[model samples]
Target: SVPSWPQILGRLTDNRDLARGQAAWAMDQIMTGNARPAQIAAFAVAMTMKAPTADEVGELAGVMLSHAHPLPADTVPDDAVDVVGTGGDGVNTVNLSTMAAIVVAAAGVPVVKHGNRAASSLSGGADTLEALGVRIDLGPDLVARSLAEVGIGFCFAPRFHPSYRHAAAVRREIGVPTVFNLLGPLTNPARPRAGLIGCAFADLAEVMAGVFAARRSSVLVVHGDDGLDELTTTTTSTIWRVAAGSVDKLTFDPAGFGFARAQLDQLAGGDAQANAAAVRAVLGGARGPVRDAVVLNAAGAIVAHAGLSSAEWLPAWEEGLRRASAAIDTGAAEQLLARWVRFGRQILA
Candidate 1:
């Protein structure tokens, strides 16, 4: 059934059901832009106060897909997966998931990572990767080719999500984070088969899983109670997995898995330069928690990608981590970045 604006407005003005149904209708209206900015503002505020229902999220997502960048879903590498976050955890941990992709690639799992420049963090994945000379602006063919040949690639949000280009001003003018913040992670251009998403909110795990289930993915949703986006070694993290239509929740604590419990200080990289320095050190085989943490995150991605269900996977991950550590140490990851930069420079010339 088509959505009705009057129903959405009624829900916004009333408190019954807190407009979860009306929120969905409001999404339909805002998505279709049948509502004015005032109505959209009211809906956003009301939904924020009442928490958006999964149905409403779904309706908004559906509307989002209608206006997002169109890509040939079948064109990416087989078994491609995305490790992303709807980031706003306030933990600025130097792109842990981005570093994880390097580990995944080193472990031979293909990745098609989609992200934007920094907003909440001191630096975002795209911003950091670009600063390190990654070719995030590659067109579709090169992105597909990079995935096929290099086991990894990046799709920048600003380049691919057309609506963002149109709405950049509105978002900036509003000057505060909005729901569009979460929408970026959900809008991968490559259409991967599996996804590992990190959330700041525990309830978002189920909500995100429901979205992936609607899109039909083999999915894992995680949140580290320690305040990092991904499963953190310092404390217990919650995980939810969805395969087909079923979703399961589980807890993870790294200390039980052979990691030392360190404080948040162990993971700090002061600024983008400091973060890049730590990344360089880790990629070049500096031994410490920074390297170990990236390995742990990447190995989780590899484990999830390979469908590994063994207690033995941890030891194997440690081994994979060593190899990735070596791969980056020998300057392969750096060389890959150099090559991308060289060609990126030539193209601009």
Candidate 2:
């Protein structure tokens, strides 16, 4: 028998796995229009305050993944990784994750990047990719093929997770960060074995680390002290590396990586048009903190996906940064972008 909304609320009130079960149940009800708008909002707010455990988040993610349009398992390489940011950070940086994903792919890392249109930011990965003339609406097989042919695949979130449509609406209606915000990043359709996730809040690093720890995937969760989701060039960023059911806490400093301290405004993002220009500028070897920031974040993704230990993390990071920098310096990243854009233009035509 399906539990009543009140019953679900009562379970969450007690803070049990029942809370997790109820959250999942409520999602179904809300999606199917069996629950009232107020009930949906109430449950979302309650879960935030009650504080969802890793197990709970993982359970919900399982449900979401079940409904997702996943990429073909055999099509993706074993080492493919995603670089995604939880977009609610409100920092509006210049599509750092998207830019970094390109660089990571340029550095020979297979990437399956998952993103959406602007949800609450100046520009999102999908928007920026679209602005840069990359097709964002390909079917699943083509998306997988992009990975096979180009070393990178972009799973535009809406196309991959149509079931999340109602959830997205509810989140926008609620107008605050909800569990869905975190789940969106967690539920990549390609199911990449490794990735980097940048959290909107510093404490979320631990929460996400726990979620990934239970799954045994290699992932790094990051939160910039300056409030950007991606690693900040202005301040130290907290990092939680999750691998093989264990978590390691660490911090990364911009200065330590030969990057000068930058102001938040220096990395400020704008509309897709503006951001597309920035992407071209950065990949064309334009020098600034924004360029350094993309390399820093991309290097972090490289290290996370590289299977490095604490002892080797710094050296791997240094090398990864250099590789990413060289991808830009040598025009390799730009060439990759141009090729992707050409494909997109052909598809569109």
Candidate 3:
């Protein structure tokens, strides 16, 4: 039997969790404008009071993606991977997360990154991509074409998740954080199974691990003790290996991976132009915290792709470093970057 909106709101009002499809049903009504704004506001507030469960979140993300802009079938390879960070770090450190995806793709793995322009940071993955001469928001066909030809592509968030606008105003009018804070990374349009995701806060890292576990998707989730959303060279970071319905936590240090400590300033980035220059320099074999930082993140993506358990993380990090650094030291990473830039710009030109 179909429950009315009032019934659904009442369930949440009593602080009970929404069943898998119930939350999705509520969101569908909200996005389709079939529900009143006041009822929508009530749902949001109730959800804020009690965060949604992983199953509920997955259900909501699944329903939301049903409304997502579609990509052609198999445009991305089966082993395609994404390295993303839920960026509230606010440090804007050279767009290292984006660089990791580039390095991994350069190592001959496919990468389909879903990201947005800088919201809190001065530079983001898409922003840096534009500064590097790749066209931003080139639409699905071009993005998919690039994924097939270049082994990498970017899905601009707004273009892929347009259904969010229906509740955008109400979310803002309510002036509080909601489940939406977590949806951007959760709702990758391509939904690649292997990924490396980072969170700025520790608690959200656990929550994201739960969400990925619910989908039975194996991914690496990380948080820096030093407050970066990446695996920081400055200090040890927490790594969550979410695989096969289990979540294992690992304390990771770059030192074990043959990396020297770096000050936060060493990874600082400026505007898009400056970040773009930094990315090129690192790819061109520039050494320092910047390059090591990029490689550490690349190693994370490799670890996720391998789906190794904690016992193997040490060796995985070593071998991951070998492949990732070779991708740079041999100039393949740089070449891949140049190729993607040429492909991205030629289409728009």
- The RMSD of every model to the true structure, in order and in angstroms, is 3.5, 2.1, 2.4
- lDDT, each prediction: 0.68, 0.82, 0.83
The better candidate by lDDT, 2 or 3, is 3
Lowest lDDT 10-residue stretch of candidate 1: 304-313
User: Could you give the candidate ranking by lDDT, starting with the highest?
Assistant: 3, 2, 1
Model 3's TM-score against the true structure: 0.91
Number of the top candidate by TM-score? Answer: 2
Q: Write the per-residue lDDT of candidate 1 for residues 1-349, one digit (tens) a residue.
A: 3446556545544643433444455555555546666666655555545555556666666666666565555567668878888787888587788887766675566788988877767888887777676687877776776776666878887777655443344455555555555566677878776767888777556877777777767667888888677868777888786665667787776675578876777887556667767767777767778876887677666655654233354565466556566656677665555554565565565
Q: In candidate 3, which residue pairs get closer than 3 Å at backbone N, Cα or C atoms, i.e. clash?
A: none
Which residue pairs does candidate 1 place in steric collision? none
Clashes of 1: 0
Give a tens-digit lDDT track for model 2, residues 1-349: 3678788777666674453466567667765556677887777777777777787778778777888887876998888888998878877689999999999998889998988898888888899898888999987888887887778889988898887777777788878987667887789898887888989977556777898888778888988988888888898988888877899988778797678889999988899999999999999999988898899988888887887333377787888888899989889899888877776666544
Q: Least lDDT summed over 10 consecutive residues: which range in candidate 3?
A: 308-317
Ten residues in sequence with the least summed lDDT for candidate 2: 16-25
Q: Model 3, clash count?
A: 0
The superposed Cα distance between candidate 1 and the true structure at residue 213, in angstroms, equals 2.2
Decoy 2 TM-score against native: 0.94
**lDDT by residue for model 3 over 1-349, one digit each (tens)?**
3867777778888889886578888878876777777877788778757766777767767787888887788686777788898787867588988999999998887898999888678989889999998767867788899998888888988888777776766766876656666677888888888889988878667778888887777698899999888889999999888989778888887887568888999899999999999999999998888999999899889888877334376777778888899999999999998899889768845
